[PDB]
Amino acid sequence: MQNITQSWFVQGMIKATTDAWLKGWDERNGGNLTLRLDDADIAPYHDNFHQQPRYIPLSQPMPLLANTPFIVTGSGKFFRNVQLDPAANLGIVKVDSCGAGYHILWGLTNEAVPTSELPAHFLSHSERIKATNGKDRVIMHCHATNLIALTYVLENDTAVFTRQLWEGSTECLVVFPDGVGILPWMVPGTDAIGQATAQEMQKHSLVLWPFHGVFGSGPTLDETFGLIDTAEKSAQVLVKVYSMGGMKQTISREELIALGKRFGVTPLASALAL
Amino acid sequence: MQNITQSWFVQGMIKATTDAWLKGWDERNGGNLTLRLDDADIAPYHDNFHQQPRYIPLSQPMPLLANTPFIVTGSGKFFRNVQLDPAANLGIVKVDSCGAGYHILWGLTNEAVPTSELPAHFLSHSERIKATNGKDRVIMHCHATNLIALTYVLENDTAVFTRQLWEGSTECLVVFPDGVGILPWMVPGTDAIGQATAQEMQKHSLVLWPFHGVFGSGPTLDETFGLIDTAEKSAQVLVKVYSMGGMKQTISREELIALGKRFGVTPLASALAL
Amino acid sequence: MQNITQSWFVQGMIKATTDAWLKGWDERNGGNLTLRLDDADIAPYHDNFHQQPRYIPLSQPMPLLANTPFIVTGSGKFFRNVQLDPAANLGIVKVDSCGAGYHILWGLTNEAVPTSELPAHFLSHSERIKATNGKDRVIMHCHATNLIALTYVLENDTAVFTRQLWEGSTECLVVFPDGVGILPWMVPGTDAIGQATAQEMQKHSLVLWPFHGVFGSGPTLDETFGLIDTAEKSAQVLVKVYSMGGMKQTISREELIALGKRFGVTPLASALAL
Amino acid sequence: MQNITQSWFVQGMIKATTDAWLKGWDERNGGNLTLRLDDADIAPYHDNFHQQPRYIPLSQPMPLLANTPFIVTGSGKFFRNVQLDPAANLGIVKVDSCGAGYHILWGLTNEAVPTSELPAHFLSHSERIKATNGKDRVIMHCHATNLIALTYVLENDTAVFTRQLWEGSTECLVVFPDGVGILPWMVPGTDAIGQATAQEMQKHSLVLWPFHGVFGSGPTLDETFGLIDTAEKSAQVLVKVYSMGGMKQTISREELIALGKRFGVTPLASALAL
Ligand SMILES: O=C(O)[C@H]1O[C@@H]2O[C@H]3[C@H](O)[C@@H](O)[C@@H](O[C@H]4[C@H](O)[C@@H](O)[C@@H](O[C@H]5[C@H](O)[C@@H](O)[C@@H](O[C@H]6[C@H](O)[C@@H](O)[C@@H](O[C@H]7[C@H](O)[C@@H](O)[C@@H](O[C@H]8[C@H](O)[C@@H](O)[C@@H](O[C@H]1[C@H](O)[C@H]2O)O[C@@H]8CO)O[C@@H]7CO)O[C@@H]6C(=O)O)O[C@@H]5CO)O[C@@H]4CO)O[C@@H]3CO
Ligand SMILES: *[C@H]1CC(=O)N(c2ccc(NNc3ccccc3)cc2)C1=O
Ligand SMILES: [Zn+2]
Ligand SMILES: [Zn+2]
Numbered sequence A, B, C, D: 001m002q003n004i005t006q007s008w009f010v011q012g013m014i015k016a017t018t019d020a021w022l023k024g025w026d027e028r029n030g031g032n033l034t035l036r037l038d039d040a041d042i043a044p045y046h047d048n049f050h051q052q053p054r055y056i057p058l059s060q061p062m063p064l065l066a067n068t069p070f071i072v073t074g075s076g077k078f079f080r081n082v083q084l085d086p087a088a089n090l091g092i093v094k095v096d097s098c099g100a101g102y103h104i105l106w107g108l109t110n111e112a113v114p115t116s117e118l119p120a121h122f123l124s125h126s127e128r129i130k131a132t133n134g135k136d137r138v139i140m141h142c143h144a145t146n147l148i149a150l151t152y153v154l155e156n157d158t159a160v161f162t163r164q165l166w167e168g169s170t171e172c173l174v175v176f177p178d179g180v181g182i183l184p185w186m187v188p189g190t191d192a193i194g195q196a197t198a199q200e201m202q203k204h205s206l207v208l209w210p211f212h213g214v215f216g217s218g219p220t221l222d223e224t225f226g227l228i229d230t231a232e233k234s235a236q237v238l239v240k241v242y243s244m245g246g247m248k249q250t251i252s253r254e255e256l257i258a259l260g261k262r263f264g265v266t267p268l269a270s271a272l273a274l
């Protein structure tokens, strides 16, 4: 029998980390990746399961994610090294039936632990199932080069930042009609910043952090990568245009209304009012 | 018998799309490619043709493309994965006797359909055949990065933009003396955008969609790729000098007038006036 | 038996050169890279050892490096060509028990000689041992594109340069809390530059050569790569922000101390108080 | 301000129970009804809300239904009396932010509590959101007079039972292509019967309990009533024909394929096999 590394999800995880390394958003060990699975998916690969599932408690209870398996990226690992050693960089966990801990059933070899952003990754998983009726399954974080440079010149508010991104290209409005949410500056790695991010996940599928990076979610990896990929391309044009002397002509407010009606999308009221 | 995946026109598609994802042009699902073929080309590959060709009516009758087969890229597909699975992403179609629709013969599995810009393809394919006596065989669309940012700062004029594009490099004038078409901003995926795009093809081989991208048309795949990339290089040259404070010396009109007649080429008279 | 070229350190250094090759940092033959080894790491591979080891005396005595084996690159050797020929581009040397000479054991064939900057690498190799108690093992030098351009604009003072890099990315204060030291411009390849470069290595892990390149040290082959990669990305963001027109809001001094307080890193007082 | 008793959802809950009383399926206090609302629906009626919302703990957590309001019928109430005193027979509940209980805001005066079959209603509400993508909102239970008679004489199996009601009338195929579910006889009002009912709701929108009654689901009250109404009328002609001696000519298996293909409806596999 083929080992678990030949499964459909493991091969998918290599594709995401390999291509992000060529894009240039994951210098050193920046970025994380988590995926949601089903109990039927991992059924044939019971042989690979470790004989000692390590148990790690949860920071706070998550009743909604009871008996839910995930495949995550280990902490302190290089995204470029994932394609070379899947066993030592990845792993699978399963949330207990109570919602206060998980068991490491494979991977994370040599006392490796999941990403330190797990409280942010798990809290946003819960708030997106409710807002999508169990469709979104993937959470991704990356330090988009063109998005970080924007937070130093643009006002740090939800309205104007979302409006600016809509004018970067035509397809931007269609992909994320709900806009993006930007927080004030906060120290990473704390639960106080995970709650704020999870609060903004209730209304948007794209989250911005000033001077740090970006957050996104989607149904599958291909659709999740496309959401971030489209967002960064719009930022690339703006930085190039802004250094030329600033914007001169752009899409009018009424023009975006006509675009929204054709594709059956509802633009954000706050942003369109600008 | 050699598989259809190894044919010359299939190997042409895998080369052209992969060379566009590596240039940062086709984020998400942006981009499509239709190439005209002959009945002799598809004759040896009758074994792999589908036994139940689904019939899909065309929006408008196209008598000039009757009995003319085409190869198309699927709608909503990702240019990164075309090399990974050409059959699920590429397809072949054939126009019926009366020019009212088309049949699916191979590819486009799992209820896949040709690209949503198909009406914009056939309206321009028919016109380009008339202008160049059937030499044209490729239609290319992609989201070049530096090209789009030019529309945000320069006047959206056919003559003005072509004039600037000629001064960016010495080879640009010879490659496209006919100039590049420009259109107002409009909603994609409609037959109205198909008419306007095909209408301007009577006098230009390239059309620029503001804030969206570019439209290509040429005799073969190799020249079509280099037809737009020549304008992309002039844009990258233009972008760098613009941020420097402006352009101070360039090719003068008196230098340009003698250049074309060295090669015996007829320049665009409208741009020569400026 | 297995060739020494199939060991861990030979394959490991092949990665480091090729990765930096595509970044655009090491055109022609610029840049250097050495790694410290152990006697046990090379014990079983005496088969590839040269029968007669050539002897070269050191310019100045180095007592701390006595009887220690190293692996280095060759002078006048491009970083691209290494993967095509491991033997003709690398070499392993072992300093004598006195600290005055070394013998070439394997590699460096065809009268190959180590890099001309060997005094600068050996001087910094010894002095980093005192500071890190033998943890650091790699010294790297390469022409980082965006760090070179910064010295033309920013003043060459430790307090100003360190603060700007800390503000271009959140993680910078955690990666190099000691700051970056700046030297005056000197003629390369001499011994005067080697003594000043080592002088700054007592209080910095990143030393900048104006208009020439950067120096950095790391515990392993990958940590030293990320250290330069993290610092390069920070300078890349600062280049666009400064070129876009200016910098308007920033991370305040109160936030900077709070960020370093959480991760247990002491910022440089002189630059922090700015 | 218009009274809450004249709202669009209270006047719609009277109609559903009054109409079933004239059918005869709700003798004494048999049957109950629940409806899902939105927070905007009950916002204007804040004035009439009780100042001391009673808190009732739930048997088991229901995290998916957090912060969701409903309207239900009381326990031990007569369907005939709802039109006489709406405030004593109906009530408004709201699940808390965690999912372990609910409050009572209006109605159910003189210490009245919701129906004893709420866990069955709540568990089916949660499940049908996943299998339908948030469209089904209503759950109804009633004792069909004839459908009980069919159980005493027909084999208690899912396959033949589904196919027989499919032969009653032509519209039966279109309305419920997924058939009906039949459970082994268990004592009503238990948590075991609630879990078993929810499992069958993952496939079909009609559930049969032997000798007791029926369950239904739909987007609105009118659409939910017509599902059971169509099922009952189809079962009416069955016993009428059956009591005359049995069937003599019925619908062939072939005609079920032709009718389903006409309206783009995929029938059940096992039922169509018979
Ligand atoms: O109404 C309910 O929400 C509840 O409200 C009141 O409770 C408040 C507490 O009095 C108050 O101190 C505070 O609680 C904090 C607590 O002090 C902290 O220590 C921490 O709690 C963590 C806990 O220490 C940790 O062990 C774990 O808890 C799990 C628990 O061990 C495990 O057994 C299970 O709990 C189940 C419980 O055993 C069941 O009986 C039942 O619980 C009922 C309970 O019996 C009812 O009385 C009622 O609780 C009231 C409570 O009485 C009020 O005082 O309702 C409960 C739900 O039906 O079900 C439980 C779930 O299965 O799981 C526990 C967990 O879910 O994993 O984790 C704890 C969280 O990290 O934090 C709490 C919260 O800050 O605040 C309470 C809310 O106001
Ligand atoms: C949300 C859902 C839920 O049930 N929660 C919760 C709160 C408190 C709690 N306390 N448990 C406890 C307290 C003291 C001693 C033993 C157990 C358990 C669960 C939420 O927060
Ligand atoms: Zn980050
Ligand atoms: Zn496009």
Ligand SMILES: [Zn+2]
Pocket: C030, C031, C141, C212, C213
């Ligand atoms: Zn140098």
